């Protein structure tokens, strides 16, 4: 089961990488849009937060799937 | 079947990575477009949501295919 | 045929990654263009949809080819 | 010939990835350019289509080469 | 357990890579947005900081998961 | 010579990837520049075409080199 | 322990890569924001410096973790 | 010497990838700059050409080095 | 110790890659910011130089660490 | 010493990739900045050239290090 540790480790690493850069950029860019024009400022950042929920859904479910695949 | 765990783990990791960055950026950029000009604001974000459905279709189907390939 | 599972799994992962980021960005950017100027708004998003068809053609055919290569 | 399946699978995956992101971005950006200014709108999108033909030429020929290399 | 060291090492490397580029860009872009327009300057940078917390949550949890997978 | 097939397959995949994204983006961006300002429109797109010739020179020669290396 | 050297070497390489590009871009973009508008110029660059501290925290801790994993 | 073929094949693939995307983008962006403002148009594109010479110097020398390393 | 050569070779390659693209972009973007507005031109480029020092610190230390890991 | 050839080949490939894209983009972007505003045009491109010297310093030294590691 030594390979399983790496499989999950790389999968999680991939999950962290994807959501990490996706959300990092999502926050800054969201912020940049708000700064450019003061139109629906709270709403734009709120959309950003839902984006965070959506993007992180993938790494969370990916980790769960990796766990189950290793388990069964 | 030890290799199968890694195959699915990396495939899912790839799926999470692609949709995660694609949707993260899709949300922020969508938001940025809305902020730049107050034209069809609800529609633009709605298009973003359909984009989410389209982009995540790929990781969902990819995971399913990986499962079946391992299974058969 | 254990290697075949990984071959298809990584190929599909690659397919999901390419189209996922390509279409995710295509949707948001398409949206951003429409937001910037209200010129041919329906047409621009329509072009985006055909872009989706074009980009996903690659992962779909790639998956099919992977299946056949494994099969024969 | 088990390695051959992976060789073609990864090559095609690479082909799908390159053209998929290249064309996805080509469509959205082409669209963005048209939206920014209403100058030679049909021509710009047409150039985009030829771009599609050019970019996909690479994955198509790559797949063919992979097939022949495996074959001979 | 020699493979375990690499599994965690690459996972952490992936974690550092994702959050490192995500937060690096988040800080500069956040800064760029503030510079472009003097609207809600403290708030925009504050949003950036929460972005940092969100993005680094992934590498921190990823490292923890890698540790546990190696442990059990 | 089983490894040779993969060597060429990955090299070509790399060639398709580099030129595919390079030319895809070159076409759309070239198009975007023309759209932004109606200055030397034919010339700008022409420069784009020479760019295509230059960028694809690399994958073409790379494939040839891979073939010869396998051959000798 | 030969694999351990590579594990740390690649982890550090990953650490250098992530922070290197993250901070390189953070410095230039920070600079670009300041150049665009003369608003809170010292503060913006200062935020950039804290960004540097944050981003490099990841590679530093990653290297430390790699060392300990190899050690124990 | 079977590994040597792959070493050169991947090195060349890397060379084609780097210069291919670097020059593809260099041509389009160069073009975009010229389009934005009609200032020193011939000179800007000329600088682009020297950029091509500089960027391709790397893949050319890399291929030569790979050949010699295999040879000796 | 044959693996050690590759470990350092890839680590250095990673170091060169990260700082190379980080500093290459840092120089051009820094330059672009200065060109956009003639405000604190020497200072902006100077900040760029310190950025170079910061970014290259990572590859230099990474190479040193790789050397020591191989050594001990 | 068969692995050594690949180690240097991939390291050089990495070196060419990093500097190739870094300098390719540095030239075009430098050019774009000059085109946007006619301020210190020779100086900006000159800064670009020093950027080239800085960025290529990394691949040159990386290749040298790879050679020595293989040698000793």
Curated annotation (Swiss-Prot), chains A, B, C, D, E, F, G, H, I, J:
An example Gene Ontology CC term for this record: proton-transporting two-sector ATPase complex, proton-transporting domain
Gene3D superfamilies referenced in this protein's UniProt entry, alphabetically: F1F0 ATP synthase subunit C
UniProt-recorded Gene Ontology molecular function terms: lipid binding; proton-transporting ATP synthase activity, rotational mechanism
Transmembrane regions: 1-21, 48-68
Location of this chain's protein in the cell: Cell membrane
Topological type in the membrane: Multi-pass membrane protein
HAMAP family the record matches: ATP_synth_c_bact
Family statement drawn from the similarity comment of this UniProt entry: Belongs to the ATPase C chain family.
Described function: F(1)F(0) ATP synthase produces ATP from ADP in the presence of a proton or sodium gradient. F-type ATPases consist of two structural domains, F(1) containing the extramembraneous catalytic core and F(0) containing the membrane proton channel, linked together by a central stalk and a peripheral stalk. During catalysis, ATP synthesis in the catalytic domain of F(1) is coupled via a rotary mechanism of the central stalk subunits to proton translocation. Key component of the F(0) channel; it plays a direct role in translocation across the membrane. A homomeric c-ring of 10 subunits forms the central stalk rotor element with the F(1) delta and epsilon subunits.
Stated name of the protein: ATP synthase subunit c
Biological source species: Bacillus sp. (strain PS3)
């Amino acid at each position: 089961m030594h390979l399983g540790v790496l499989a999950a480790a790389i999968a999680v690493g991939l999950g962290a990488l994807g959501a990490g850069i996706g959300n990092g950029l999502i926050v800054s860019r969201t912020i940049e849009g708000i700064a450019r024009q003061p139109e629906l400022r709270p709403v734009l950042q709120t959309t950003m937060f839902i984006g965070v929920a959506l993007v992180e859904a993938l790494p969370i479910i990916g980790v769960v799937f990796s766990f189950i695949y290793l388990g069964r």
